[model samples]
Target: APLPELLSNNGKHALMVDGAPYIILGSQTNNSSNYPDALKDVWPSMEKMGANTLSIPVAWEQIEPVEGQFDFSFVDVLLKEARQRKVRLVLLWFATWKNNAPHYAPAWVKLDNARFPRVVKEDGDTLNSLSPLGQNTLAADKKAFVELMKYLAKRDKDHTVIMVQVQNEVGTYGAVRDYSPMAQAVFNAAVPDDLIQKLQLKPGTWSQVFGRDADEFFHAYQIARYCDEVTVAGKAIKNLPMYVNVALRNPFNPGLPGQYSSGGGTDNVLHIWKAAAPNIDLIAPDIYFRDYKTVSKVLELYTRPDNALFVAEIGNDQPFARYLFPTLGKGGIGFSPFGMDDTDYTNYPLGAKVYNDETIEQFAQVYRLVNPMMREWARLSYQGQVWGVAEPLDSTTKEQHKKDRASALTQQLDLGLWDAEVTYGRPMFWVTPPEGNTPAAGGALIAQLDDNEYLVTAYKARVEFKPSQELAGKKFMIERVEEGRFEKGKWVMERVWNGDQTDWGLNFTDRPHLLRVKMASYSVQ
Candidate 1:
């Protein structure tokens, strides 16, 4: 069978698994949960979360502990267990640059500072992270990555491994770019002609072309090229859909290069990443921000005609699950939360404080609802129009939570011919005003099936549609609303909703709901 392919059409994207559109209800294991023993705790978390795909690391040290030799013992176990659990895999190559550090590299590579140099700080001190300009480092990393890809090609004949993440949060901190002699020599040279043409920049040295942004832009270009080399070599062997995950900068208040993960694929340098790395399928955001505005903005920035939005890692908390609505509404291919296993590690300010049945249910509820119709959702999103919204939150604390309740308002989306309004925490019977949920747990998605028809889903929210100015003289009404499930790629209606169900907005409570709504307009004569 052919490897899984991420194909795009009409500016929308889909991950085609086994020759069909596949939406990844994905879960990522913790940083240290790659060993054989840790597998005991990882499976239940994935099972409980109802994940269709597992994103787990395959560290460089684990495979190539001894120089000139390799080990696939842990990978063998991972593959067998994943097959047993009937879940697809997305292997993360934790190598020369895991979060900009060489921590994951084998001792042979990490200890040899003279051979595999680290990035030099502007003040001449050395950082722990490896420099992208190190040719030896790239060659070793690329060789190990190619060997791993070859192993997958031989071992995963059934296409159990669908995609591969090239690197994790690749960039440096405390310094924008390396100031080493090797780096300095390259920086002073004229910018590469291909990059100059791709970015439409004047032909000159980095400083002459980019001026103030030169340091970071040069670093980003080098890092992107390094990753692209690794990706290109690996794809030549296995040819699976591959991507790089970003440790994002603050979109609202981006301070400086070192403030965030500089040189990584931040939103500002997306064009640089695109221009430098043509082999990489997408540049994904690892979302930790909880504010609705920031999350929505990041989603919008990442979702481009040239790029496919995949929430590579998000907070494994309740509020974060609601963003799946907007992610798929934007035609994203996948969504995964970080540190999802039961290994008793919590990335506190970034994710949940606990990983219990109740906390796990937060993601489980959403995944379970979408699993049955994921193929349908993926197909509709790729071929048609869809819109989704999460309840707005300015912050995530008790004091701010109260403020969110006081300020939450209806979100409106104009769907060309009609306008859909989403309200949070409103009474179903009468016109009791909305106060919004305490944790702001409301989200809704609408996928246009045709000009007058839509597929709707929501959690703790109400969605209503009214005719636009095009139908000014006509009265609007819900001709029919069918509650249904997709079975074998067909809509199987459970019942038709009328009277009370359509009297007010289509009410969706804590329970999962899917509605096929047919709309109509009549002349007022």
Candidate 2:
């Protein structure tokens, strides 16, 4: 199978699939949307959402109801449907862990708690999640996962499934650290010299070495090893690419233990997680932040040379959709909004953000806008040829930014020959009518194809490019502004903006416009 590979240049990154940079314009089904019949409604929803990739769960409970008895029915159906629709798949392995719980484990494992015991809380209560300290849990999970991968490699030699998520947000929620006798024993043991050297700490116990962060660190190490062992087993089977998604703590207010999913790859433990788990390809952020600052912070924390930014889950509301701009423009390899094809599309918490199917049409517009140039976006983004800015989710925050005079009112950049200034979140402006209410969502991307030439796409923002400050006497004259798209790896011009156009800073409508511009600098004689 053609496993996906990460490609990078100058610190920017993308995933190369099918021998080309492939952007995942994706959406995921609700937790249970993977069922045979429940998935039918999801297809129509995916079509409405204009997504090219689908993230669905492959539950171990369904695949292996009885110990040693494995079923490939669910897997086969998923492959068949995905192939027929021409959409790719990112299968989430809902095995020993699903949202940090062991609810998805097969019945045999769940019933036999003695063998695969639950995580012991500090007060002696057992969490729903399995103890990562146990070897049995790892063996069972790895065995089932390996079987799944081997079956996938055999069935999908074409690599219809691009990637597999090792576990869904693996971590404990109720307690900061597992207190089982076994876990406690390991935690009290000398902080493994390997960990000490990697973490650069003097040899000591877990707490002595890690200090206040000890409990979480120990959990992270154990969980990472647990997940990595499974990944290693899976890779050995089919050698397909694998990743783990993290349930994060608030970057701004990362409270004490029990505040966030302890032991997961929260930003605080990313270093430990990375060092502990070398096998997982990436640890993506499940962004459900209500505001832009928080969401932007998560994006910042996860995007790294080693950790590719793939938004595994996000809010699907109108306010949330605006983030698509920065995510793609800032070199995110994959983007997915959760609860897309959920069985219940309206009432539940996951589906509530969906805005009762209304968002499908709205987001569909966005997918169509970006889907065509998805690959080019990946390539351009990796070359560091792209830059993006958006409105603050909070108006008060925007007002504070606006206090910076030039930056408050507009964003100025020296990208190419043009002095580009954008009124963030202001979308398009009508100076004649003096209209604009400070849009709730607005952003744009400017990409440098070459010096004196560039392409741009924007939504809900007013952008103008002019002569640079250094070229004081020289004025920028728009040579030609062609509205077009790339087709068959060639630039195809559709509409030329002239006369009334380009006069108003390329005023944009609600729909995104891709404009290729050639600027001429001349003496202001």
Candidate 3:
């Protein structure tokens, strides 16, 4: 069968063709290394890492080595191999933008500046940008992108290449916003009222409308304008899904407009892209931050119910896989860590190097078994059938307030209750705090695998269950617990919980523990 169509149901969540939860557990391949000599070994390793899709780049330098010349051989090989492995693909078009550089520009274009001018620096020195105002550059990029999309429609319209990234890490660097005369002219002119209308901002002049974010606002506008043309051309050829990925900027230390980035990447500018290019289905984040809390929060903001979450690029380290559980447990449609190949075996030897070959094999085994469960999980997430630990609160309560008038109490009284809320109004499984004075700095997330079946990851918490509907306010008892990895596409139980142990199946102090619960009505609610 062709790959499943990824569509939004109720404008909040994506639904697959099978009506099961679908996610793109993905990874990125080297931009210039899609040849059989390189991908033969790399592709299998990716599949083994539980990757269902690969994010590989199609370079402008290679595709259009000279003006008007196009090459489809690399893309052809990539799609063919991905299908052979029974995996889907997300093609990243490395056109006008790539990691904030015009390095991917064809040699002829790079050598001939008069034909395709570069962006000018603040000091009037030219920087390496395929000038946004250069008509030839825009025309060439649009033509090539449209041709590629047409090729995709003809060859892989069945969904072999499910999505396409318009460009890779598109933004300006070494300068904040563009300083070229043409760029300055456009910037000084009134900002487009269309953008203001899209953002629902009160009608006003450009400067008054965007205020402090005008620079990034205009930068995103320019990029989106270019992308809008390309998207229109591509959509005209094939109406497949398309998106763009952002190089995340620190929210706390946002760079002055035109100082760190021109405007394409900062979180604030995403609105500009959304307004300018509505055809783009989603905007993904290339996460490189170490703080999981901060990164996850940023993702939450970007992956609002109206938009599906897809991690375009992340670290290929063990912690990344460890962090995958929460991202997937939420409603992310895809996850792809960057750089998955043995080309640099001495430095990075694929999954076997970061995670042992056995562990990698085990991961693949679990992913295949969990594939069916994801459909249900996605449904639960969309309905808000999920919960997580909010920040720790001081143990102050109404009871504590009542005792404040009395002399200082000798005993330490823990009073604050852990705050938990549910989405979709489903019954939640509450995990007990670990045995300790100070609570572990982690929480649990519950996902329903089916009507009666559920999966919980105890991240620094000991979990217990409660009745779906309280009868006389009674709590339910756990009927049993099973622990083990899925082998040969089946749940191979390693142990079963009974007796007092039923209250605590495993100790998840520092790492995570996956638990499968089978419950019975121990008492009437």
Best by lDDT: 1
**Backbone clash pairs in model 1 (N, Cα, C under 3 Å; residues 3+ apart or in different chains), count:** 0
Give the RMSD in angstroms, all C-alphas superposed, for model 1.
2.2
Clashes of 2: 3
Candidate 1 lDDT by residue in tens digits, 1-525: 766998988898989999888999999999999999999999998998999999999999989999769998989999999999899999999998898899999999999998999999878999999999999999999999999999998988998899999989999988898999999999999999999999977899999999999999999999999999999999999899999999999899988998788999999999999999999999999999888888999999999999999999999887798898899889999999898899989888888877788878888877766787788888888888888888875334577854555456578888767789898888876656567876777788888888889888888888888886676577889999999898877789999988888888898887877899998898888
- lDDT per residue for candidate 2 within 146-168, as digits (tens), equals 89998987888888888899989
Candidate 2 minimal-lDDT segment of 10 residues: 427-436
lDDT of 3 at 523: 46
Better of 2 and 3 by lDDT: 2
The sequence of per-residue lDDT tens digits that candidate 3 reaches over residues 410-515 is 1111111211221111112334322221321334456655444566654433455545454565445555677655455466777775565553433344433456
**How high is the lDDT of residue 175 in model 3?**
64
Each model's C-alpha lDDT? 0.89, 0.79, 0.63
Ranking of models by lDDT: 1, 2, 3
Query: Mind sharing the TM-score for model 3?
Result: 0.78
Alpha-carbon TM-score of each model against the true structure: 0.97, 0.93, 0.78
Q: How far does residue 330 in candidate 3 sit from its true spot (Å)?
A: 2.9
